[PDB]
Design a protein around this ligand. Sequence first.
Ligand SMILES: Fc1ccccc1CNc1cn[nH]c1
Length: 191
Amino acid sequence: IKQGIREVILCKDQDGKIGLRLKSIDNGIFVQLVQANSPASLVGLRFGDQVLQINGENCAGWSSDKAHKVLKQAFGEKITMTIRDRPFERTITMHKDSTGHVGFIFKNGKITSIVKDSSAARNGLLTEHNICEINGQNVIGLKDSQIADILSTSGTVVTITIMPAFIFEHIIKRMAPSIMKSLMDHTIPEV
Ligand SMILES: Fc1ccccc1CNc1cn[nH]c1
């Protein structure tokens, strides 16, 4: 998770879609959903990203409705956004044991216990954090079984992007889990 602000320049698809849902948190605007194969995915927007500006308007104080309204009205030949990278998240690097474990239990995406003497304990993995990404792959919406598969079919070094449950809960609110399982970009990023 960069400590970095960055500009992205977007262009609507032939359907006038960018593939984004925004959500208002603590008088910021945060990315609730990046759609697979969208402009939003292509410029590299991620779950949990803060939108500081849209076309050089500050987003501070907007409803999620006003954020979505603004998007709709943009002469969207070209859309500029100032992004703060995933401010509510942190990345932890672990190494599997010979048993092939990093050493935690999760339920519905959320870490619930740390196993003693483990790489998770050594790196201070916290419980009551939801798992947002795994080796830069968004895994939000996926079943527990599929998350477990991605951890199985990884190298010895594992990278996990976590977010405090209470913050995760407040972001995803008013999004059908199915839509996030169905449409939340779970792809490895293009180059
Ligand atoms: F499984 C769920 C149950 C309720 C809301 C969302 C999900 C998606 N799964 C998830 C959560 N954190 N990471 C992955």
